[PDB]
Design an enzyme around this catalytic site. Structure first.
Site, mmCIF file in Angstrom:
data_model
loop_
_atom_site.group_PDB
_atom_site.id
_atom_site.type_symbol
_atom_site.label_atom_id
_atom_site.label_comp_id
_atom_site.label_asym_id
_atom_site.label_seq_id
_atom_site.Cartn_x
_atom_site.Cartn_y
_atom_site.Cartn_z
ATOM 1 N N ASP A 107 0.844 -1.179 0.000
ATOM 2 C CA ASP A 107 0.000 0.000 0.000
ATOM 3 C C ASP A 107 0.885 1.235 0.000
ATOM 4 O O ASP A 107 0.516 2.292 0.513
ATOM 5 C CB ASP A 107 -0.950 0.003 1.210
ATOM 6 C CG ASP A 107 -0.216 -0.037 2.570
ATOM 7 O OD1 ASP A 107 0.983 -0.384 2.644
ATOM 8 O OD2 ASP A 107 -0.870 0.262 3.590
ATOM 9 N N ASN B 97 0.697 6.757 3.793
ATOM 10 C CA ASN B 97 1.711 6.402 2.800
ATOM 11 C C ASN B 97 1.333 7.024 1.463
ATOM 12 O O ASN B 97 0.154 7.240 1.191
ATOM 13 C CB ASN B 97 1.814 4.876 2.627
ATOM 14 C CG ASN B 97 2.267 4.179 3.891
ATOM 15 O OD1 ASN B 97 3.045 4.712 4.647
ATOM 16 N ND2 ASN B 97 1.793 2.956 4.102
ATOM 17 N N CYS C 101 6.302 7.246 11.674
ATOM 18 C CA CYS C 101 6.055 5.823 11.459
ATOM 19 C C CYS C 101 6.500 4.965 12.653
ATOM 20 O O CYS C 101 7.380 5.348 13.417
ATOM 21 C CB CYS C 101 6.815 5.349 10.238
ATOM 22 S SG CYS C 101 6.325 3.694 9.630
ATOM 23 N N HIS C 102 5.900 3.787 12.770
ATOM 24 C CA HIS C 102 6.183 2.827 13.843
ATOM 25 C C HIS C 102 7.255 1.793 13.455
ATOM 26 O O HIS C 102 7.641 0.952 14.273
ATOM 27 C CB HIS C 102 4.883 2.106 14.182
ATOM 28 C CG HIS C 102 4.088 1.740 12.967
ATOM 29 N ND1 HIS C 102 4.398 0.653 12.174
ATOM 30 C CD2 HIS C 102 3.058 2.373 12.351
ATOM 31 C CE1 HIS C 102 3.594 0.631 11.125
ATOM 32 N NE2 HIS C 102 2.772 1.664 11.206
ATOM 33 N N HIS D 23 10.610 3.282 5.694
ATOM 34 C CA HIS D 23 10.577 1.904 5.191
ATOM 35 C C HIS D 23 11.903 1.573 4.482
ATOM 36 O O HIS D 23 11.976 0.692 3.608
ATOM 37 C CB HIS D 23 9.408 1.690 4.215
ATOM 38 C CG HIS D 23 8.065 1.798 4.868
ATOM 39 N ND1 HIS D 23 6.882 1.650 4.180
ATOM 40 C CD2 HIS D 23 7.725 2.075 6.148
ATOM 41 C CE1 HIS D 23 5.870 1.831 5.009
ATOM 42 N NE2 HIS D 23 6.355 2.093 6.209
ATOM 43 N N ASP E 263 9.707 -2.476 7.968
ATOM 44 C CA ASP E 263 9.274 -2.644 6.580
ATOM 45 C C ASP E 263 10.412 -2.620 5.597
ATOM 46 O O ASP E 263 10.233 -2.973 4.438
ATOM 47 C CB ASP E 263 8.237 -1.570 6.236
ATOM 48 C CG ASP E 263 7.062 -1.635 7.168
ATOM 49 O OD1 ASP E 263 6.322 -2.636 7.073
ATOM 50 O OD2 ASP E 263 6.895 -0.722 8.016
HETATM 51 N N1 NAD Z 1 -3.900 0.243 7.899
HETATM 52 C C1 NAD Z 1 -3.097 0.643 8.898
HETATM 53 O O1 NAD Z 1 -3.245 0.180 10.060
HETATM 54 C C2 NAD Z 1 -2.000 1.682 8.619
HETATM 55 C C3 NAD Z 1 -0.771 1.769 9.528
HETATM 56 C C4 NAD Z 1 0.287 2.809 9.227
HETATM 57 C C5 NAD Z 1 0.094 3.670 8.096
HETATM 58 N N2 NAD Z 1 -1.089 3.522 7.286
HETATM 59 C C6 NAD Z 1 -1.347 4.396 6.075
HETATM 60 O O2 NAD Z 1 -2.504 5.244 6.368
HETATM 61 C C7 NAD Z 1 -3.382 5.412 5.156
HETATM 62 C C8 NAD Z 1 -4.764 4.901 5.432
HETATM 63 O O3 NAD Z 1 -4.704 3.612 6.135
HETATM 64 P P1 NAD Z 1 -5.782 2.408 5.904
HETATM 65 O O4 NAD Z 1 -5.046 1.238 5.419
HETATM 66 O O5 NAD Z 1 -6.689 2.260 7.096
HETATM 67 O O6 NAD Z 1 -6.721 2.931 4.683
HETATM 68 P P2 NAD Z 1 -8.202 3.491 4.642
HETATM 69 O O7 NAD Z 1 -8.824 3.262 3.323
HETATM 70 O O8 NAD Z 1 -9.019 2.792 5.703
HETATM 71 O O9 NAD Z 1 -8.085 5.070 4.906
HETATM 72 C C9 NAD Z 1 -8.416 5.330 6.302
HETATM 73 C C10 NAD Z 1 -9.357 6.513 6.343
HETATM 74 O O10 NAD Z 1 -9.090 7.416 5.177
HETATM 75 C C11 NAD Z 1 -10.373 7.960 4.897
HETATM 76 N N3 NAD Z 1 -10.336 8.709 3.645
HETATM 77 C C12 NAD Z 1 -10.261 8.328 2.300
HETATM 78 N N4 NAD Z 1 -10.262 9.340 1.454
HETATM 79 C C13 NAD Z 1 -10.336 10.466 2.184
HETATM 80 C C14 NAD Z 1 -10.373 11.890 1.819
HETATM 81 N N5 NAD Z 1 -10.341 12.295 0.565
HETATM 82 N N6 NAD Z 1 -10.447 12.775 2.904
HETATM 83 C C15 NAD Z 1 -10.497 12.418 4.204
HETATM 84 N N7 NAD Z 1 -10.474 11.063 4.615
HETATM 85 C C16 NAD Z 1 -10.387 10.114 3.563
HETATM 86 C C17 NAD Z 1 -11.225 6.688 4.783
HETATM 87 O O11 NAD Z 1 -12.566 6.829 4.473
HETATM 88 C C18 NAD Z 1 -10.836 6.062 6.107
HETATM 89 O O12 NAD Z 1 -11.678 6.428 7.206
HETATM 90 C C19 NAD Z 1 -2.624 4.650 4.014
HETATM 91 O O13 NAD Z 1 -1.794 5.551 3.248
HETATM 92 C C20 NAD Z 1 -1.791 3.604 4.774
HETATM 93 O O14 NAD Z 1 -0.745 3.060 4.028
HETATM 94 C C21 NAD Z 1 -2.108 2.519 7.584
HETATM 95 O O1 LIG Z 2 1.517 -2.526 4.281
HETATM 96 C C1 LIG Z 2 0.550 -2.372 5.334
HETATM 97 C C2 LIG Z 2 1.130 -1.518 6.473
HETATM 98 O O2 LIG Z 2 2.214 -2.329 6.966
HETATM 99 C C3 LIG Z 2 3.126 -1.755 7.872
HETATM 100 O O3 LIG Z 2 2.527 -1.643 9.138
HETATM 101 C C4 LIG Z 2 2.324 -2.901 9.830
HETATM 102 C C5 LIG Z 2 3.482 -3.114 10.791
HETATM 103 O O4 LIG Z 2 4.759 -3.264 10.124
HETATM 104 C C6 LIG Z 2 3.115 -4.411 11.570
HETATM 105 O O5 LIG Z 2 4.199 -4.557 12.463
HETATM 106 C C7 LIG Z 2 1.767 -4.366 12.304
HETATM 107 O O6 LIG Z 2 1.942 -3.351 13.280
HETATM 108 O O7 LIG Z 2 0.687 -4.009 11.402
HETATM 109 C C8 LIG Z 2 1.003 -2.781 10.618
HETATM 110 C C9 LIG Z 2 -0.252 -2.574 9.711
HETATM 111 O O8 LIG Z 2 -1.293 -2.499 10.716
HETATM 112 C C10 LIG Z 2 3.643 -0.391 7.374
HETATM 113 O O9 LIG Z 2 4.515 0.103 8.378
HETATM 114 C C11 LIG Z 2 2.486 0.540 7.117
HETATM 115 O O10 LIG Z 2 2.997 1.805 6.683
HETATM 116 C C12 LIG Z 2 1.621 -0.116 6.032
HETATM 117 O O11 LIG Z 2 0.468 0.732 5.788
#
Ligand code: NAD
Ligand SMILES: OC[C@H]1O[C@H](O[C@H]2[C@H](O)[C@@H](O)[C@@H](O)O[C@@H]2CO)[C@H](O)[C@@H](O)[C@@H]1O
Ligand code: NAD
Ligand SMILES: OC[C@H]1O[C@H](O[C@H]2[C@H](O)[C@@H](O)[C@@H](O)O[C@@H]2CO)[C@H](O)[C@@H](O)[C@@H]1O
Lengths: 478, 476
Positions: free
Chosen positions: A118, A152, A173-174, A202, A259
């Site tokens: 992603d 991201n 980032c974590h 990453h 990552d």
């Molecule tokens: N999934 C994770 O736990 C995680 C962890 C670290 C970083 N990230 C990064 O954070 C971003 C979102 O994470 P995700 O995987 O939950 O995706 P997601 O699709 O769930 O996006 C999360 C939120 O973004 C909102 N969103 C979408 N378009 C928008 C807009 N135009 N304006 C305002 N809000 C909007 C969604 O509706 C949702 O509530 C990605 O770039 C991802 O890589 C995600």
């Molecule tokens: O590619 C998805 C997501 O993966 C990474 O985050 C992971 C993390 O590395 C794991 O340790 C565990 O915590 O779950 C996370 C996703 O919830 C990336 O660091 C993140 O940016 C990316 O969106």
């Protein structure tokens, strides 16, 4: 006065609740106003319901505001945290399928040193454009506010914003907590370890790893010799000590962290079986179709449970969040969700997300160490001043104070890993800023998966023809 | 002044230096020591050289040696044009690469398609550069090391980073500028041009005519005459579709061999090479084009041996009169003319070695395109990477020009940086003996499909008999 913090993409529940609970647990930031913004009204309403319940249940005085409008989350804000993913997972997968249809396994955005599924940098013009649009709105409406990039791509995104919009911006980032898995596996006390990481998001390396006044890598060497043979991953993302990681460590001289392990060369990702060999059975890592589906499914379940919990809170106004799992069943999905709720309900436990502590360091001078994404400006040797790097820094009322990188990153890391990774970041940004489609065609002409010019023209044409990409197509028109 | 030439058996190169030396009054009285390990090719060049000198009445002493120490001692200039292993080793190794699925061999890489520009499998060649250099430091520390042999970029960077002697690399590639000037119909003296980059990786960063930007004139030519363009031989690709396409992406024209050094896009297979480099050869780096070139080399060596023989069979006859004694045999008379043509081509060779020496010793200053440590000349490249840029050379030495306009960012970021990374791999593998560097290059190669393919192609190259020290060097 009340500190105003706005969250874009607030519908991402776990993240928002971690930030909300951390605030409640931070004396100096009590009374803050959190404006939650999203375009998905349901997900937005759900997090508002749960966050309001939390604040009342724990006795905090945090105030909330709801909006689907970018201007309202930015106006008057002191900090603007962006966790939004424009297009969501539906956009990511439609594009990936178009890529695979034209012979690009895992999609055109999967590149040497950027396999994170992603972490799109070329096909997600709309995501990059949103970063810039948010930053310009901050510049116009709340010029002194900080832009905190959580979404991201962090590397490309933060570099794009800091180079083009004059506002204070940092990415968080974590990833670095991979250091803690290595420490625990070696049986070392975390507080006794002197570590440092450096690189790009990453794309970070454990440049310093000392224990009891000495280099601790020999301990890792001992672990690899004696126990790695029994190593097995617990889930698709558990690859910090995988063969891929160890092999990168052997070549580069320092351990890739988090990552960064996924972000290897094409060697470990030629096919599923190769992925299984380097990242472990049964998934072949987070970036195989098996491992990524595993991930997508957990995400879906988390959103389902959040919606359920929100509904229940509204129908049973007396229920306590600590009466978790009396309302929720006992399947893996729910049990994990309850563990998360218990951690946020524990007043003495912070979530680990750096956003709130960062705000507290800046506003109340409660200094601390952070791993931040900031313009390099000479911190890492051999990288341009305006490339955003991920390094440790002390943060306090006077701002961000980067640590000196020592020992410096090994030359192999800078020359053979970071430089090519930076070149592709430069292509992504140049394509985005200029609208010159031949930058993206150039990336594909050099891609090992490309076999012909027709293949490049077709994959690009189909991506630019998607309905949500009309302005992207016009941006790239010759 | 003593000038030593290593690999003197390289006929065209040697006879051209002989010819120019004879026409440089400032170097009259000089001693030229020819050295090679092939006694036969060595004697032939020496025989022709002394005979030519006699003819034109120049004052030059020519000697031969098969000993490296003798060519270096007392020398003021040591010119290296030797290729360790020769073309035999090159093709041997290429065949091995192709056996394991690497079309044109493993040394053919993005931005380095030049067929005789090996940088990884030619450990023996790289070691010779260093051996020569260390002996210069030991025996004639003040001598200049002039490298003609390839690879110039890796070789000169390697030598300058490791041995404290004066070294410069020289090539003829930049002459592609003149072809552009001629095809556009411009007066050469009114053209203000500059090139910059690394060897076989230079670009026309400045192209002006009567003070104005002249690129619009090339654009006119492309738009109106490129459709009728055809190459005269495999190397004639300065105005090819490949060159034009690189110009369109990078903003400046790639010059000379740089055109051959594109990405894999123009070299996927023979038909693709023909599309980009023209019919019928597909450029100098296809099997057809390279064979065409190999044939010319074989022909030249045969010619010089035949003529050297005639010279000994007819001791009292002048070179220009040799045909007069070969009677009705036109073939033999033609051989002599072939050799004279090499010594005195209808148009000047442009080789820079002799002019360079004359510039330094007699202050007969001129503009040169040299390979020297960057030291900030090209922005964005490390100080110790050897670059190819223009410079004024006089009694006080080399005076690099300021690069202006600077090379476009696309050239530095997307062409030079990746090219430099592979030069860094080549040098690190050679200096450390860590075979994992060479395996890494191949793990990233688009032609690589598996780890076993990488292991085996490397093992077979390392098992060649000429490579025992190479194998030892890369062990453990
Ligand atoms: N999934 C994770 O736990 C995680 C962890 C670290 C970083 N990230 C990064 O954070 C971003 C979102 O994470 P995700 O995987 O939950 O995706 P997601 O699709 O769930 O996006 C999360 C939120 O973004 C909102 N969103 C979408 N378009 C928008 C807009 N135009 N304006 C305002 N809000 C909007 C969604 O509706 C949702 O509530 C990605 O770039 C991802 O890589 C995600
Ligand atoms: O590619 C998805 C997501 O993966 C990474 O985050 C992971 C993390 O590395 C794991 O340790 C565990 O915590 O779950 C996370 C996703 O919830 C990336 O660091 C993140 O940016 C990316 O969106
Ligand atoms: N800079 C330029 O303009 C330019 C032009 C043409 C060729 N080249 C380079 O010149 C080199 C040789 O060119 P070539 O095609 O004549 O090759 P070649 O192998 O046919 O001849 C080079 C000479 O090296 C001699 N030689 C081999 N090992 C030697 C050793 N240990 N000591 C001394 N002499 C030795 C050979 O016997 C031969 O006479 C190559 O590296 C080639 O790429 C450079
Ligand atoms: O790869 C063989 C050889 O090719 C080039 O030399 C060309 C030169 O560029 C042409 O202008 C013409 O003079 O023929 C030469 C070959 O005879 C490279 O410049 C050279 O380094 C390389 O060895």
């Amino acid at each position: 006065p009340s500190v105003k913090i706005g969250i874009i993409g607030a519908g991402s529940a776990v993240f928002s609740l971690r930030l909300v609970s951390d605030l409640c647990k931070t004396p100096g930031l009590s009374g803050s106003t959190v404006t939650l913004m999203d375009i998905d009204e349901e997900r937005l309403d759900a997090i508002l319901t749960i966050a309001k319940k939390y604040v009342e249940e724990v006795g905090a005085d945090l105030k909330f505001e709801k909006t689907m409008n970018l201007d309202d989350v930015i106006i008057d804000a002191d900090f603007v945290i962006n966790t939004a993913m424009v297009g969501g997972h539906t956009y990511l997968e439609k594009v990936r399928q178009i890529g695979e249809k034209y012979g690009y396994y895992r999609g055109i955005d999967a590149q040497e040193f950027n396999m994170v599924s992603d972490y799109y940098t070329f096909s997600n013009y709309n995501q990059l454009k949103y970063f810039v649009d948010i930053a310009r709105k901050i510049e116009k409406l709340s010029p002194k506010a900080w832009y905190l990039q959580a979404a991201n791509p962090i590397f490309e995104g933060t570099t794009l914003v800091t180079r083009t919009v004059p506002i204070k911006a940092v990415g968080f980032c974590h990833g670095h907590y991979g250091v803690m898995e290595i420490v625990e596996k070696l049986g070392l006390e975390e507080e006794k370890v002197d570590w440092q990481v450096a690189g790009v998001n990453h794309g970070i390396w454990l440049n310093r790893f000392r224990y009891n006044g000495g280099n601790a890598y020999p301990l890792l060497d001992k672990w690899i010799e004696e126990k790695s043979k029994d190593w097995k991953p617990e889930n698709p993302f558990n690859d910090q000590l995988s063969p891929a990681a160890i092999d990168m460590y052997r070549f580069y001289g320092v351990m890739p962290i988090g990552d960064t392990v996924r972000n290897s060369s094409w060697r470990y990702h030629r096919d599923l079986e190769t992925k299984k060999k380097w990242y472990g059975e049964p998934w072949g890592g987070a970036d195989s179709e098996i491992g990524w589906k595993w991930y997508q499914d957990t995400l879906g379940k988390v959103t389902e449970i959040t919606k359920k919990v929100a509904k229940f809170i509204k129908e049973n106004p007396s229920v306590r969040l600590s009466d978790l799992g009396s309302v929720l069943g006992k399947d893996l999905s729910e049990k994990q969700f309850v563990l998360e709720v218990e951690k946020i309900l524990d007043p003495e436990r912070k979530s680990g997300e750096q956003h709130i502590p960062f705000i507290d360091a800046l506003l109340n001078d409660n200094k601390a160490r952070f791993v931040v994404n900031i313009p390099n400006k000479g911190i890492i040797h051999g990288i341009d001043d305006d490339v955003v790097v991920e390094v440790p820094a002390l943060v306090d009322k006077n701002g961000i104070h980067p640590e000196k990188i020592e020992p410096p990153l090994p030359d192999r890391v800078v020359k053979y890993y970071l430089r090519p990774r930076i070149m592709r970041m430069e292509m992504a940004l140049e394509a985005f800023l200029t609208g010159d489609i031949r930058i993206i065609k150039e990336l594909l002409y050099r891609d090992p998966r490309t076999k012909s010019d027709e293949q490049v023209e077709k994959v690009i044409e189909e991506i630019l023809a998607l309905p949500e990409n009309e302005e992207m197509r016009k941006h790239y028109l010759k």
